Design a protein around this ligand. Structure first.
Ligand SMILES: CC(=O)N[C@@H]1[C@@H](O)[C@H](O[C@@H]2O[C@H](CO)[C@H](O)[C@H](O)[C@H]2O)[C@@H](CO)O[C@H]1O
Ligand SMILES: O=c1ccn([C@@H]2O[C@H](COP(=O)(O)OP(=O)(O)O)[C@@H](O)[C@H]2O)c(=O)[nH]1
Ligand SMILES: [Mn+2]
Length: 287
């Protein structure tokens, strides 16, 4: 029976938000005791999954760097399975993996609009969870491919439902959050509501929770299509609506998904993951 106090110490980072009003911890560098967690999870012999999509030129531009960095930094010391979804398997970079890492690749259909490529991930992830992921891992993370692991991204991030604080808005007020503001959309969040602005580049939890996260998000995506509307920030707008209704049991600080374009302020102690510079002119084929 793992207890929050066993591994989480908010007092180590007094200058930032370390606890939500619903008692969920916000994991910042310095507040976690990975050694305690590694031993605890090793004894339970857990396996962690990681899904990543790479469709079109996202493959040549980001897949190798992502996987290479994941192999080295993701859940080191524990069995891990990388689930790679690509539209063209012949372009799969196939790198050498280290101890406790293995993978499996799936060929998927490339949607015509990049917006749909991004949103369809929700439907696809759920299908795979039902078909096999639920039987293969204890925890699963779903990530964007356009980023790179920079340091240990370990078990301190595991939980029932895990959300990521977006690097640009972690200190902003709810009314400045770029939530979908049109009531016609299923992702609508009225001003005066909201806890944080979560980044869709990273989210996870147990297979059961992620299944519900992805299922609900895609239901909203399909609903909007029937009402001839598309969320301003697509799947991210829907993810934020979901996490508003179903609070995450754990939140990761921006240190786990940092945009170096902002620079490196005092609150960012040790970057575990960083954004890749945007290259839409090459990787995207439509507006
Ligand atoms: C203050 C400000 O406008 N900052 C923006 C960032 O928000 C922006 O990042 C994008 O943010 C949206 C949600 O608003 C979504 O998370 C996108 O995936 C993310 O890239 C950034 C562009 O990289 O520019 C800043 O100026
Ligand atoms: O043409 C596309 C559009 C999106 N994606 C995937 O969907 C994620 C979301 O897209 P993107 O990174 O372009 O979103 P941004 O973070 O820049 O908003 C990407 O990381 C990829 O994993 C992809 O493979 N091909
Ligand atoms: Mn991205």
């Amino acid at each position: 029976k793992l207890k929050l106090s066993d591994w989480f110490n908010p007092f180590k980072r007094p200058e930032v938000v370390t606890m939500t009003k619903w008692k969920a911890p916000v994991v910042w560098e310095g507040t976690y005791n990975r050694a305690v967690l590694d031993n605890y999870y090793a004894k339970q012999k857990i396996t962690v999954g990681l899904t990543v999509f790479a469709v079109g030129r996202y493959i040549e531009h980001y897949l190798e760097e992502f996987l290479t960095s994941a192999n080295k930094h993701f859940m080191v010391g524990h069995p891990v399975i990388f689930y790679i979804m690509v539209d063209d398997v012949s372009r799969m970079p196939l790198i050498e993996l280290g101890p406790l890492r293995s993978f499996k690749v799936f060929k998927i259909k490339p949607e015509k609009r990049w917006q749909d490529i991004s949103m369809m991930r929700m439907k696809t992830i759920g299908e795979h969870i039902v078909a096999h992921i639920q039987h293969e891992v204890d925890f699963l993370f779903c990530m964007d491919v356009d980023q790179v692991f920079q340091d240990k991204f370990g078990v301190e991030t595991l939980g029932e439902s895990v959300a990521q604080l977006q690097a640009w808005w972690y200190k902003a007020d709810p009314n400045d959050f770029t939530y979908e503001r049109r009531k016609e959309s299923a992702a609508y969040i009225p001003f005066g509501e909201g806890d944080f602005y979560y980044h869709a580049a990273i989210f996870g939890g147990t297979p059961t929770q992620v299944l519900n996260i992805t299922q609900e998000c895609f239901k909203g995506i399909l609903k909007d299509k029937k009402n001839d509307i598309e969320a301003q920030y697509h799947d991210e707008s829907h993810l934020n609506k979901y996490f508003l209704l179903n609070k995450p049991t754990k939140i990761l600080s921006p240190e786990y998904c940092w945009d170096y374009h902002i620079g490196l302020p005092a609150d960012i102690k040790l970057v575990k993951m960083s954004w890749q510079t945007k290259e839409y002119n090459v990787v995207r084929n439509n507006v």
